[PDB]
Ligand binder design. Structure first.
Ligand SMILES: *[C@H](CC(=O)Nc1ccc(C#C)cc1)C(=O)OC
Length: 324
């Protein structure tokens, strides 16, 4: 599966790191009009949180070079201008956040790619979350979205809980770090470094798009904090069926070891956020942190590396869309 990456922000770069090590994915090309190849190599090699790339990174006038692999680089502001047809590109991965709708991501198909995966929520492209609704993908869909990192954390857990106990209603808080991506959000323009900063989040509503049965049943908000790029979801749900916390743990652990293996993780250890840097799960259930007040009222806690697990999911979706 031959892929090209549009945009070399943090997501674009971690997607590259993961796709390079994927045996059946070949990174063919990178486009980003705002950087030179020397800067691209620098940004790819070094990462404050996920370590130096464990391999040799260099560049020449036309490539980024990684452990012998030449990745052709381009600087096109209009993705339609890109030689995806000539380069035999199967899937274009758009990590810019600006070509995220059906009519704008179309530019990659227009350029010769067979399909597009958008690493951002879309209003028009169908959204898929691995372990949640990837079975609903059909090969005629040429442009898809991987939703958001927070939705990828919430949705697998909400599905497991809803399938086993039924979610009547849930309110969510995310304690959210300074991750990838101020006159529309006044709080967000204040200094990060010493502040807890409340914020809106559409993750709890966007779960309704990938789990229609939870449409309108979840909402929430975020407190943003100046920590490493691992965040945590705090989901307070009202359940339809009575249960015990022990039963919740067994169901989550069972899903984590079985059908959601690799997507939903499970720990009982005394973890803190930095313990999940570089974790490739979308959602790691913190069994010891949750708390049950009564048989149908529980608080569930789940961690996610807001760059790395999501980027692993992007590559997962690329392979799933290509296998179909
Ligand atoms: C996951 C990374 C992420 O959480 N970005 C993010 C989300 C909300 C806010 C605010 C306010 C800032 C940054 C991701 O990018 O999903 C694709």
């Amino acid at each position: 599966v031959r892929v090209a990456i549009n945009g070399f922000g943090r997501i674009g770069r971690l997607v590259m790191r993961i796709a390079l090590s994927r045996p059946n994915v070949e990174v063919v090309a990178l486009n980003d009009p705002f950087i030179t190849n020397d800067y691209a190599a620098y940004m790819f090699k070094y990462d404050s949180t996920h370590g130096r790339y464990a391999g040799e990174v260099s560049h020449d006038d036309k490539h980024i070079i990684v452990d012998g692999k030449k990745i052709a680089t381009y600087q096109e502001r209009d993705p339609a201008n890109l030689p995806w047809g000539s380069s035999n590109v199967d899937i274009a991965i758009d990590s810019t956040g600006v070509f995220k709708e059906l009519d704008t991501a179309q530019k990659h198909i227009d350029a010769g790619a067979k399909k597009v995966v958008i690493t951002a929520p879309s209003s028009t492209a169908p959204m898929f979350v691995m372990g949640v609704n990837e079975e609903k993908y059909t090969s005629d869909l040429k442009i898809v979205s991987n939703a958001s990192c927070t939705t990828n954390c919430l949705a697998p857990l909400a599905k497991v809980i809803n399938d086993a106990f039924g979610i009547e209603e849930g309110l969510m808080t995310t304690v959210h770090s300074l991750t990838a991506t101020s006159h529309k959000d006044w709080r967000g323009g204040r200094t990060a470094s010493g502040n807890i900063i409340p914020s809106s989040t559409g993750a709890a509503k966007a779960v309704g798009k990938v789990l229609p049965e939870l449409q309108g049943k979840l909402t929430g908000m975020a407190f943003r904090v100046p920590t490493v790029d691992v965040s945590v979801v705090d989901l307070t749900v009202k359940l339809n069926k009575e249960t015990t916390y022990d039963e919740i743990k067994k169901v989550v652990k069972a899903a984590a070891e079985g059908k959601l293996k690799g997507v939903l993780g499970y720990t009982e250890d005394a973890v803190v956020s930095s313990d999940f840097l570089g974790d490739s799960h979308s959602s790691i259930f913190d069994a010891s942190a949750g708390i049950q007040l009564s048989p149908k009222f529980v608080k569930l806690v789940s961690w996610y590396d807001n760059e790395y697990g999501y980027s692993t999911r992007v590559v997962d979706l690329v392979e799933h869309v290509a296998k179909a």
